[PDB]
Amino acid sequence: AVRSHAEAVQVSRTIDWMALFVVFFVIVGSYHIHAMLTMGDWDFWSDWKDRRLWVTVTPIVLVTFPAAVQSYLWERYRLPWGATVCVLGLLLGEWINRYFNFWGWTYFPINFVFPASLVPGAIILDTVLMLSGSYLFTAIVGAMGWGLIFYPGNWPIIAPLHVPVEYNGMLMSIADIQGYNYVRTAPVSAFFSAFMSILIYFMWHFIGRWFSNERFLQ
């Protein structure tokens, strides 16, 4: 079958691309369902990006996949982009939706329904696991970073939305006015979320062992 060890390079390459596509969209698909299902839509609205709930739940609920696919792509391929592939999947998946649907379909401004920024964290996760290749180490300082970095990671996008306005006699931030106008139908929070991500990264490290499982049945 295999002619030369040069064509062998060509197959393994045209495999790399095909596999990557699978891995990537199957993530985009299942990871997105997970964000969705386990959320009360803080990601949908600029005026739900708050200091307590958004800052706390988001990093926690999201460590899961990264943690799980980290436990595979590194363990079995020494491929240290486990976390960041996940994150990119969710982001693309959401942007394509927010642009063509939240804006294109029904007409919500983008400056209103943009998603939360996720890459910084996943980089911390990916790199921390790569240097000092201990999962236990990643689960502690890796998940720590992922949690902590999140809010400051969104702050440059968010801040302009928090300028004070006296809107008809009442203090409101721009973000508030946005949710008010476009009609639908506090770093302890950070620490909490980091402290929590640890048990979640951890629990999901083992969940990922199972999804890596290679058995056959009968």
Binding site: A8, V11, S12, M18, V22, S30, H32, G93, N97, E214
Partner: protein
């Protein structure tokens, strides 16, 4: 010879179909699709439903039916030369699955997400429900099965016993029937409002995580490549 753009079919077949759909709702989202108790809904939208369910049972029966009968009986002795060609076509099936999942689990899902924000639902059968649940999901499940069966019937390695990660990968989709259907079901007692954080949606999250069994499936697929006499030429030449 080797692996064709029979693949280009797989990528464009959904893309075209679903882009026609996005147009189709795009024009009838508003017009018919707002008030379900209007007779233009029972034609442009309800008939659409009955049409698809029937088309899905049929194509599913034909597609799985086809492959199970054209199962390679004399598998015992066929060349590494084709144990590659086939391995590649299998990978096309997986690209088709993953693409199909993208549309279902990411696209039409978070679309329905926006739709809920903008109109209070008249039925469990909104346009985006007709498309999200009863068109999008059956399609990627059918694609799922196809791939599984192709592998079981066309490649040794996968012909021996049942792949647990591959079974989880194709059955998880199918289990999301009630899982994603409990979305509106569950959320009706304590709180009828479609709050995605509600326990009613946790089944969709759990069945969505079964997509991670793609990692176990791909590991087994690449091991099937290595058993088929590949990964030894350039691999050792490295």
């Amino acid at each position: 010879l080797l692996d064709k753009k029979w693949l280009t079919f797989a990528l464009a077949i959904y893309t075209v179909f679903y882009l026609w759909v996005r147009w189709y709702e795009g024009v009838y989202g508003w017009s018919a699709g707002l008030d379900s108790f209007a007779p233009e809904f029972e034609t442009y939208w309800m008939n659409f439903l009955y049409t698809e369910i029937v088309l899905e049972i049929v194509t599913a029966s034909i597609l799985w039916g086809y492959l199970w009968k054209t199962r390679d009986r004399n598998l015992a002795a066929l060349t590494p030369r084709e144990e590659l060609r086939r391995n590649f076509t299998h990978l096309v099936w997986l690209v088709a699955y993953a693409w199909a999942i993208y549309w279902g689990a990411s696209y039409f899902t978070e679309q329905d997400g926006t739709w809920h924000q903008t109109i209070v639902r008249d039925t469990d059968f909104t346009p985006s429900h007709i498309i999200e649940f009863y068109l999008s999901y059956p399609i990627y499940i059918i694609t799922g099965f196809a791939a599984f069966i192709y592998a079981k019937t066309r490649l040794p390695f996968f012909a021996k016993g049942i792949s647990l990660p591959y079974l989880v990968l194709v059955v998880g989709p199918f289990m999301i029937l009630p899982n994603v259907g409990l979305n509106e079901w569950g959320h009706t007692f304590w709180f009828m409002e479609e709050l995605f954080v509600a326990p009613l949606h946790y089944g969709f999250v759990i069945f969505g995580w079964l997509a991670l069994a793609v990692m176990g499936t791909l590991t087994q697929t690449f091991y099937s490549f290595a058993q088929g006499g590949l990964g030894q030429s350039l691999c050792e030449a490295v």
